Design a protein around this ligand. Structure first.
Ligand code: F43
Ligand SMILES: C[C@@H](OP(=O)(O)O)[C@H](NC(=O)CCCCCCS)C(=O)O
Ligand SMILES: O=S(=O)(O)CCS
Ligand SMILES: O=S(=O)(O)CCS
Ligand SMILES: [K+]
Ligand SMILES: [K+]
Ligand code: NA
Lengths: 433, 560, 248, 560, 144
């Protein structure tokens, strides 16, 4: 068995003597609540619909339809709209439907009732049932005539169904459409790093945790946490994402004034030796000694934690995100040179980091850290142990990036950050054990 | 008079090749079936001789008209010509297949190889991250270097391979802007000047929509678009935009700011012609299935040259759009073989749809007290669509020559609904009203003749009326935003280009664009190889093998 | 405290690699702050560092337990732009090799963003922090200014035959021999500057051979570093095995 | 002796153009930097004069070498040539860009425009539903009509438009079959005769895999594939296959049985080159991203002509595959601009990788007691990969001219790993073992030189060792079935064509195919425009502008 | 799977990989495979997992426990967890060495991940992959 203690985002002990099996996505009640909650949630931009209609800016990407402008006082009538949407989205009065106004009625948060995701293939009912309820509510509230109803519908839904997604629309989630998945199990991995930093209000520990919960739940859905992989996955998840034993936060604090990427590597090796995870194997004539491990899963988990420590201290020192690509690379390369043992994910964090560095500093694609995610072709390759560091690095930005969460993620960040378990996931996961 | 009088006289009362047709009236109900075979037609004879020579040269059977079913070659009835509508250009159908007509291929290449990409966000990256000052002078150097580099030439490295200019002379970048100071200060060689290219009211409308924003109209090489695919266009653009920013702003040649420029060019600042479509018909962006009808209408340029004849705008749009959607897309990409030339030619030959649409617009404009004054209501739609359809059907019945030209019911249905839907959209300024009229026309037509189109023609037809004003997930959609991937429209000939003309009709002579001013200005450029203001004229010139603006050939690098 | 061992090997190349990793490198020359700023090309020598965002003291920062315990660098606290230095190093026994410039950064400096390529190696940092790093690599044996150059663009040269004068080719001619010393009168992206910076005498071929971090068959052959080869093979074998089944 | 002696002498010790290179030794460590600029190179001068003429004719800036960064034109170092490996063809890099080289374009067109489609299921539909008897006589008539109809000609209807044979002479259908009686009774013009085209051992192995089944090798027109995309190929084929069954079996021209034939041609009986790829890089079937390395290796035909030199088989495969994957796919479809010619040219120029691979195969064949006799184990992989990589790296160090030719580390890494991986796969007959060697070579290389490739080169490299024998969902995959969409491989130059050569190495000189006998036989046909048995020779002939097999031009229908 | 391996018909659509044939007695060992697959697919003993051999051991029905679809975006864990359990069970049952394990994996999973789906594989559902949906809500509609 494997037992850990769970610590908060600021190093306070929350739970002692926790079986790692109890933080599994397949058992922990808070992971279930977070994942199913995200599947059920949509953001509605009522001010956005009002502006789209007033300017006939239907479909996005520069579009304007002359002659089709409509003036509807949507935000002013948000209370009546909210009521109508509630009644349409709910199945039974008293079910777990949520509809709440935010920001003076300019936005709604909608959580569809659970049955709309349980008796369904996917999570898209959160978008479609919300968009249909909003469209119907607007047509009723404003007595919209038949010849104008398609204008309202396209203001809400964007170009769908000409496009596969709601391009130019005003109903959105942090998750992307199913058809954009690179492969099996990638839906929960397709959450932009900027969105995650916004959901967690720039708390880097909580951002890493939310991203790690989604990434590792995705690894389960990929079929890659079965049998001889299950314990391996849970060790790395708990150590990197859930601050197991306070390794991430405590080491970050210890190294936070003078530490470099190299300091984090050395701290990881030192701790693995002290804890009997690795030990000297063969001494070469120069004095260099190779190390062996008695527990690949545990060594790997220590490396996963150390990779996040290095991100926090190096990107935290820059107060900027871009260096996360190089941190992820050089932590692994240096720890392998120091020990002759494989780095985190046996080369796959390093490899993801090589391509990520390239595709965040070149002409060919990518962008800043904030646009990446576990489904991105560049950053998908680690089994959940790279992108949590990316999201944490985004949270640490003091204002360097152009395509920041303020630019890319305002709607979904405002809505999804309202949900306590999404915003404060470490606390939630520990509360469930 | 009827507008098709001349074309029907050319087609049937004058000999074509050695088809022995001579005299008679275009109202005559009987005809001779001389069974002359393919040798009556010089174009078929040229094809037959070419096929026989291929068979002999390669030692493997090629074209032979005697391989028709039953060994009975085409030309049992006489083989008769087409007149390009609005012109005196007379040709064979064979001169109008997309494979055989270089202007048709270039129309598609010029759409596929194009995209629009903003400048404002890119300049913001430079300002924010590097503190650079952007001026007309820095922009002018950027545009000079970009036009050298975009076709595939080097700016930064050494000992480099480059594309050969002789193969890529159709590739370039221009800019347009709502900022009048910038429009004046950028070197005029690079500028699509909105005030010069559009009438004053149209220019004002475009400027109001774009504000002070600035844009690049990018056209990558034809030889490249033909080797690759539509999704290659924005990628090609972005590589060379990125390289040019590096040089023009003295950046590290590959730093984090370059990555934010890449995301700008490839995503945040990018306007593609259309997006990807679903798996069964999998394609990425900048393919015809993803092209909305509003974008296709805005690519066409007749409205900026002749807005005083909105019917002509509609008809030219129908021509460009029907060729692309039915001949190249449905008849090519989505099927192939002999394909769908004649499903499309009713949009641009023999002046028949033109007669019907001019008639219906005259009817509506008189009835409603001037053009464009009808209210968008059930009663207006019912009136215009019914009276138009009755005129059009009666014309086929009064002129047997027109019925024989449009020998397939699908052709007749498309023609009638273009007239009814186009006249309705023009009368109301309302694309949805136009679609409703399109479908009512079809329903009347079916009952009048006891037939409509081919086996599968009216799938969208029968879903049509109910889905015009539906708000369902995959049914609701304003007309301008419908396109070749709107579910009901995703399969069948006879509709996509017609709907594009209906969308155009809701704006022709009234607005400068239907859905996207950025697309509209992009194509307002005489340097683009295909003349989007006069697609009929380009099709006709190329039917005569006289159109001289083909890009992308490999002649320069192969033997004579 | 844990004493790092860094890297295997007993050859001069391996010893020099460990010197780079531990910042145990000899100072070879002096370069003034203003001369370095001129070569870097990001602002006028002696001028204030531009900002990309306001200083942390002016705007404060969101509540974050990590921000509370991780000290910003001086450049981060001030809001400096992210700027860079980039080097190209000849394969003909240039003292540095790209990965080892990056290890030097990652081990010895807070708040780095190093990138390794074959013909160029780069580090992006908040500007004032970057200058400290650039000075260390430029003044020490990490750089020989005949065999290396500061090149933010048009980097071609690392794998080319040396010029007859022993200097690595620069398409843009940013630095060259004059009077027995290397001089430079352009910034790193090729813009002429109004000064001529003296970068010292280049190393002799014999000193370069002794100080280099590259293996070469005609100096210190990679084949001869049995420890490094064994290390590579061990990491390969364990990565391979653990990818099949993640078990010791 | 080293295989690259001659090529390095051509490149550096003999003048090229007016570059003034003369004399010296290929081992010399120093060079002259004459700063002659582009005027030293006739090809660049031709380009520059073309660019200036374009600028003047169109009134918009085009190519100008003076627009290089800093105004310093290329040719500061001398501009030096390339020799096509295994030949005496000498050319410029500019003659090897895919845009400038018609054979390279035709290689891709010939893959994109091709598919294989069974006959057995279609014949079963006819037998089951209609009770038809299928005989050699009915098949021969079917194939005659199909070859008339496939390019786009009519067989059922009347007054039809058709494609012009002069534009579509590269389109045809042949058949192949494991049924030896049917192979002899079908008219020889239509048959790819497996016994004629393959050595007896290879023919036997193909026939064992295909049994008695029968197949159509279909090649749709190049002019069509260029207008359209890869997903158009199977659709074009199926339309004309369907038409021909209707005529050849006296069917209703559109009955339910025709629908089951359509499903047969388009789905159940269809072998495409590859399937669709995901949304970020959205493309449908028959595009390079979906092409597995096993299919690409089987398209290449060198193994049926010269199996006695398996190293040459590997090298020719590397040449065809690296050109496609790096130049057209990664450097075109997925990016563009100047692109990736020189990332690819190490596979097919200057005899350097050839030297290294011949050396490593000699090492392994002697050590393990004959070619192909080594056991597929960690110890074998470690040995061959290490000794190969040491040889290769020492060669770059002994011969400064080779280091300067392969001036980018990515080029050097690709060359080393092709040699190490190819020799290991050939020694073991095991593609997985070859991939494991590829990655060990990279790791050694990085430590030797303190550098590897470009910024992002070793993403797959570092994931590589651990993913060779992974069984995870999106990591496990036998080598033959990996391709340009295997996740780790989906982005970067220097690898896809190399892995294709490693896959080929596991089978060269031992097996008739790597993964798909149907693909193998399809391309065993001299009528295909591109010579898949000698891609290097085709590239070289086209580099000289002498290659005469280009298809798809519009010359016949445009003015001079 | 047994036939795919014996004939090296890896990936379907006419494919055969010479030299990679493997002869495993899978059907005759279906009970032992079923037991191993059950332990791997289940989360907790006594949950709602089903694994049963059908038709003389030629097939298994697998119903993954509900939590694998509840704490998941989609339905595909039924395919992926089954395919991984089966692959692992075959490797252990037949003592398959590292160099041969990719052959077994590709016999089970087909061409995935070169292809988006398990083309030529041996684990299937009546529902198609989500990426083949024409639009929102179409997954349960994609049953032949
Ligand atoms: C701007 C970038 C960053 C980026 O995203 N792409 C660039 C540039 C781009 C441009 C260069 C065209 C031009 O000269 O204007 C193109 C051709 C892609 C395109 N846009 O068409 C390209 N690189 Ni690059 N690029 C190459 C290479 C390389 C090598 C060159 C090292 C040297 O010593 O010259 C290095 C990477 C490394 O160090 O490993 C490199 C860097 C870089 N590469 C640096 C510029 C380097 C510089 O400032 O000189 N490329 C190569 O290593 C060989 C192949 C070569 C490609 C052209 C071809 O294949 O024909 C080209 C491929
Ligand atoms: C990363 C991704 O780009 P985005 O991040 O989606 O813009 C992707 N490009 C690539 O993979 C480019 C590959 C070719 C150029 C680099 C070769 S090393 C694509 O366009 O789909
Ligand atoms: O006859 S069908 O309607 O099926 C096809 C018409 S092209
Ligand atoms: O310099 S980069 O490695 O980013 C690109 C090489 S073409
Ligand atoms: K309800
Ligand atoms: K289990
Ligand atoms: Na094409």
């Amino acid at each position: 068995a494997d037992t850990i203690d769970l610590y908060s985002d600021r190093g306070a002990k929350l739970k002692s003597g926790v079986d790692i099996n109890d933080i599994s996505p397949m058992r922990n009640a808070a992971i279930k609540s977070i994942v199913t909650g995200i599947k059920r949630t949509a953001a509605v931009d009522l001010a956005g619909i009002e502006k789209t209609l007033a300017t006939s800016a239907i479909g996005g990407k520069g579009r304007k339809i002359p002659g089709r402008e409509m003036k509807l006082d949507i935000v002013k009538n948000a209370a009546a709209i909210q009521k109508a949407v509630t009644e349409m989205v709910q199945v039974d009065s008293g079910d777990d439907t949520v509809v709440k106004a935010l920001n003076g009625g300019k936005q709604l948060i909608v959580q569809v009732p659970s049955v709309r995701i349980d008796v369904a293939a996917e999570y898209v009912s959160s978008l479609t049932c919300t968009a249909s309820a909003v469209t119907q509510a607007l047509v009723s509230q404003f007595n919209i005539g038949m010849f104008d109803a398609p204008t309202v519908k396209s203001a809400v839904w964007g170009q769908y169904p000409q496009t596969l997604d709601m391009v130019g629309g005003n109903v959105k989630s942090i998750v992307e459409i199913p058809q954009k998945d690179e492969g099996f199990g990638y839906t929960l991995r397709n959450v932009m790093a900027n969105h995650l930093a916004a959901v967690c209000k720039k708390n880097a520990m909580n951002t890493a945790a939310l991203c790690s919960i989604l990434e590792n739940t995705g690894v389960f859905e990929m079929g890659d946490a079965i049998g001889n992989q299950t314990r391996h996955r849970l060790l790395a998840f708990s150590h990197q994402g859930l601050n197991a034993n306070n390794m991430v936060y405590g080491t970050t604090k210890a190294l936070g004034k003078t530490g470099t990427i190299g300091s984090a590597v050395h701290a990881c090796v030192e701790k693995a030796i002290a804890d009997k995870v690795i030990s000297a194997d063969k001494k070469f004539a120069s004095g260099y000694t190779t190390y062996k491990t008695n527990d690949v899963g545990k060594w790997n988990a220590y490396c996963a934690a150390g990779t996040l420590v290095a991100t926090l201290i190096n990107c935290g020192a820059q107060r900027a995100p871009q260096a996360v690509s190089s941190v992820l690379l050089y932590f692994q390369d240096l720890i392998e040179k120091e020990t002759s043992l494989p780095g985190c994910d046996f080369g796959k964090v390093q490899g993801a980091a090589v391509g990520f560095s390239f595709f965040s500093h070149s002409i060919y694609g990518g962008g800043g850290p904030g646009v990446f995610n576990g489904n991105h072709v560049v950053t998908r390759h680690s089994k959940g142990l790279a992108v949590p560091c990316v999201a944490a690095a985004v949270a640490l930005d003091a204002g360097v990036q152009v395509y920041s969460p303020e630019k890319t993620s305002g709607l979904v960040g405002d809505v999804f950050s309202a949900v306590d378990e999404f915003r404060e996931p470490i606390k939630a996961v520990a509360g469930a054990v | 008079a009827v507008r098709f009088q001349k074309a029907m006289e050319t087609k049937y009362t004058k000999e074509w090749g050695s088809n022995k047709n001579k005299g008679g009236k275009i109202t005559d109900k009987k005809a001779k079936y001389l069974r002359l075979g393919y040798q009556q037609n010089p174009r078929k004879v040229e094809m037959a001789k070419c096929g026989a020579a291929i068979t002999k040269k390669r030692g493997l059977q090629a074209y032979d008209p005697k391989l028709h079913l039953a060994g009975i070659p085409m030309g049992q009835r006489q083989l008769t010509p087409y007149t390009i509508s609005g012109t005196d250009i007379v040709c064979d159908g064979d001169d109008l297949h997309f494979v055989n007509n270089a202007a048709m291929q270039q129309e598609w290449d010029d759409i596929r190889r194009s995209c629009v990409v903003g400048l404002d966000l890119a300049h913001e990256v430079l300002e924010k991250r590097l503190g650079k000052e952007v001026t007309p002078e820095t922009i002018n150097y950027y545009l000079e270097v970009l036009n050298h580099a975009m076709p595939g030439a080097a700016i930064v490295q050494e000992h480099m391979v480059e594309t050969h200019p002789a193969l890529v002379d159709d590739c370039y970048v221009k800019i347009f802007t709502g900022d009048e100071t910038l429009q004046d200060e950028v070197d005029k060689q690079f500028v699509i000047n909105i005030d010069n290219e559009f009438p004053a009211n149209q220019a004002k409308q475009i400027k109001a929509a774009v504000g002070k924003t600035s844009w690049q109209a990018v056209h990558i090489p034809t030889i490249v678009t033909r080797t690759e695919d539509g999704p290659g266009t924005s990628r090609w653009m972005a590589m060379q935009v990125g390289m040019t920013f590096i040089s023009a702003y003295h950046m590290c040649a590959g730093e984090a700011a370059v990555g934010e420029l890449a995301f700008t060019a490839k995503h945040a600042g990018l306007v593609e012609m259309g997006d990807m479509i679903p798996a069964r018909r999998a394609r990425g962006p900048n393919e015809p299935g993803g092209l909305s009808f509003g974008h296709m209408a805005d690519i066409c340029q007749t409205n900026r040259k002749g807005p005083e004849d909105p019917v002509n705008v509609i008809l030219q749009t129908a021509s460009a759009a029907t060729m692309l959607y039915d001949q190249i897309w449905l008849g090519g990409y989505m099927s192939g073989g002999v394909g769908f030339t004649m499903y499309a030619t009713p949009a641009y030959t023999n002046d028949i749809v033109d007669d019907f649409l001019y008639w219906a617009d005259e009817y509506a404009s008189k009835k409603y007290g001037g053009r464009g004054k009808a209210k968008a209501t059930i009663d207006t739609v019912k009136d215009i669509a019914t009276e138009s359809t009755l005129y059009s059907l009666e014309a086929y019945e009064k002129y047997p020559t027109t019925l024989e030209d449009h020998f397939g019911g699908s052709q007749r249905a498309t023609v009638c609904s273009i007239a009814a839907g186009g006249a309705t959209a023009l009368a109301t300024g309302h694309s949805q009203a136009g679609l409703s009229a399109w479908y009512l026309s079809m329903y009347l037509h079916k009952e009048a003749h006891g037939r409509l189109g081919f086996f599968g023609y009216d799938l969208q037809d029968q879903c049509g009326a109910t889905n015009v004003f539906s708000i369902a997930s995959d049914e609701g959609c304003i007309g301008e935003c419908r396109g070749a991937n709107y579910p009901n429209y995703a399969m069948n000939v006879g509709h996509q280009g017609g709907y594009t003309s209906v969308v155009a009709a809701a704006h022709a002579g009234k607005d400068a664009f239907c859905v996207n001013p950025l697309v509209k200005v992009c194509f307002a450029d005489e340097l683009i190889n295909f003349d989007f203001a006069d697609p009929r004229g380009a099709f006709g010139k190329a039917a005569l093998r006289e159109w001289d603006r083909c890009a992308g050939e490999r002649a320069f690098v192969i033997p004579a | 405290a844990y004493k790092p061992q860094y890297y295997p090997g007993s050859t001069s190349v391996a010893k020099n690699r460990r010197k780079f990793m531990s910042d145990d490198v000899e100072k070879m020359r002096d370069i003034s702050d203003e001369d370095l700023t001129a070569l870097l090309g990001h602002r006028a020598p002696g001028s204030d560092y531009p900002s990309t965002h306001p200083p942390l003291s002016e705007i404060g920062e969101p509540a974050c337990p990590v921000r509370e315990v991780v000290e910003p660098t001086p450049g981060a606290a001030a809001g400096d732009r992210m700027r860079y230095v980039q080097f190209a190093d000849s394969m003909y026994n240039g003292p540095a090799v790209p990965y080892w410039r990056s290890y030097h950064a990652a081990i010895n400096f807070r708040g780095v963003d190093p990138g390794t390529l074959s013909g160029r190696q780069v580090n992006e940092m908040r500007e004032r922090d970057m200058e400290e790093y650039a000075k260390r690599q430029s003044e020490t044996e990490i750089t020989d200014w005949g065999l290396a150059g500061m090149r933010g663009c048009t980097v071609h040269g690392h794998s080319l035959r040396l010029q007859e004068d022993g200097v690595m080719f620069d398409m843009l001619d940013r630095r060259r021999l004059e009077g027995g010393v290397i001089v430079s009168d352009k910034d790193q992206v090729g813009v002429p500057i109004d000064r001529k910076v003296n970068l010292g005498k280049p190393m002799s071929e014999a000193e370069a051979a002794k100080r280099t971090t590259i293996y070469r068959v005609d100096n210190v052959a990679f084949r001869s570093d049995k420890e490094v080869i064994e290390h590579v093979q061990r990491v390969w074998e364990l990565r391979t095995k653990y990818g099949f089944v993640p078990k010791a």
